Design a protein around this ligand. Structure first.
Ligand SMILES: OC[C@H]1O[C@H](O[C@H]2[C@H](O)[C@@H](O)[C@@H](O)O[C@@H]2CO)[C@H](O)[C@@H](O)[C@@H]1O
Length: 451
């Protein structure tokens, strides 16, 4: 465990090409480096991290790192002043959580509209002309676009285009009370997506694989994917191009911009070797190229690499989108935001719910939830995860189970303590709300609302 490195990275990125860096390391350090690509590792990491085996180093987009940093799951990083100049200021900004760097930035990624020349020589400038493009081209399975409708990352650029946003960026810090998924604009974005599924232009259950496989084969004129896709489309031998995303209601489409980042685990026996690896083998030109060859990272964080590769019109298109869109927050609430919007988009797309109804929930689930203080922490001792029983008389509950709002507290607590959702308890929002709403009838009783 102490003798070697086990790195984690998502299935879509170039893990073999990283394995090539790992072997290059092994050679002149005598330190084996294993690359693994599990499923749902962004969620898997905080599980195993505190509960035994986690990896030495973890790759993900920066948005999740603030959460892990808050949970104390990451070693603070120590790249000297000299090394910091090798990478763009703004990429460093993406991995700072409360004035301390928490990961290395690798590459900056935003998804783009992917042409299909030979099918569509002149890509649609706007969104709203899509329905009249799929209808101009249909007699086989001659469809115009197929993108992942299972992940909110892909649907979001639409929802954001006309005024949708996650957390408002006000006064140099993101305000977790200002959520824009309920607004006129988001509501419009989603109505369109729903009107594509309604008018049979898309299928509500289109996976990443379903979308890629259908495009690669040559069925769809367009897809929406990021830089890690290109590599499989070269293989496809499909005459493709990469460009600005269509403009919904005239306003630009706004992709949430990801910065691939590499965190060292707070519980990594080998924290000194991890630095060596990342700083001195990966974040080198010969290092980043090894990966990039395998699955294109996008635009990299390395200055000394980037400008000699800004000619490449796909990178330039990626970057155009990146600048139209907005950089993701790293703050812990992001975990919840994604949950909120994933449920919301999917619940709409299936008719399960109306746009209004859906995004109504989305807004509340994204928002801060009161009475957490009464539930998280010491009170959780009342729950022994072996039997699954709860002692409602545990003094750790601070008497809360009995009293005018006892029944309500029991609802919220048990909910959160049983919650298997990610993030923990995100499914218990209504009940926490109800419980706080109850506390209000008896304010002389519950100074649980002193802030
Ligand atoms: O859609 C929710 C999901 O979006 C982002 O994850 C991206 C990631 O940034 C990409 O590099 C690539 O792996 O695709 C993912 C979406 O399938 C967020 O960064 C992530 O936190 C969030 O759950």
């Amino acid at each position: 465990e102490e003798g070697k490195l086990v790195i984690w990275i998502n299935g879509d990125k170039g893990y073999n090409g990283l394995a090539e860096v790992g072997k290059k390391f092994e050679k002149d350090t005598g330190i084996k480096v294993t690359v693994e690509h599990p499923d749902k590792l962004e969620e898997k990491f905080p599980q195993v991290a505190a509960t035994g085996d986690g990896p030495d180093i973890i790759f993900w987009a920066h948005d999740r790192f603030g959460g892990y940093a808050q949970s104390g799951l990451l070693a603070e990083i120590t790249p000297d002043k000299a090394f910091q100049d090798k990478l763009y200021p703004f990429t460093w900004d993406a991995v700072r959580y409360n004035g301390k760097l928490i990961a290395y930035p690798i590459a900056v990624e935003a998804l783009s509209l992917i042409y299909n020349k030979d099918l569509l020589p002149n890509p649609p400038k706007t969104w709203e002309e899509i329905p009249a493009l799929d209808k101009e081209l249909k007699a086989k399975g001659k469809s115009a676009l197929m993108f992942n409708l299972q992940e909110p990352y892909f649907t979001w650029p639409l929802i954001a285009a006309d005024g949708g946003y996650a957390f408002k960026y006000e006064n140099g810090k993101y305000d977790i009370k200002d959520v824009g998924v309920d607004n006129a604009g988001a509501k419009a974005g989603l109505t369109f997506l729903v009107d594509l599924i309604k008018n049979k232009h898309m299928n509500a259950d289109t996976d990443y694989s379903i979308a890629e496989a259908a495009f690669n084969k040559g069925e769809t004129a367009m897809t929406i994917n990021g830089p890690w896709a290109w590599s499989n489309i070269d293989t496809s031998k499909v005459n493709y191009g990469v460009t600005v995303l269509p403009t919904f209601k005239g306003q630009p489409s706004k992709p949430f911009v990801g910065v691939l980042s590499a965190g060292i685990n707070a519980a990594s026996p080998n924290k000194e070797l991890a630095k060596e690896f990342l700083e001195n083998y990966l974040l080198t030109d010969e290092g980043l190229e090894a990966v990039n060859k395998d699955k294109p990272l996008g635009a990299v964080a390395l200055k000394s690499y980037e400008e000699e590769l800004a000619k490449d019109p796909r990178i330039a298109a990626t970057m155009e989108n990146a600048q139209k869109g907005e950089i993701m927050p790293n703050i812990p609430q992001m975990s919840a935001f994604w949950y909120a919007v994933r449920t919301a988009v999917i619940n709409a797309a299936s008719g399960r719910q109306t746009v209004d109804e859906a995004l109504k929930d989305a807004q509340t689930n994204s928002s801060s939830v009161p009475g957490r203080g009464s539930i998280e922490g010491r009170p959780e001792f009342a729950y022994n995860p072996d039997t699954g029983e709860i002692n409602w008389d545990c003094p750790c509950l601070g008497g809360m189970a009995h009293g005018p709002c006892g029944e309500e507290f029991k609802s919220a607590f048990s909910c959160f303590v049983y919650s298997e959702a990610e993030p923990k308890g995100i499914d218990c929002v209504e009940k926490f709300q109800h419980m706080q709403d109850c506390f209000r009838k008896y304010p002389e009783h519950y100074a649980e609302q002193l802030k």
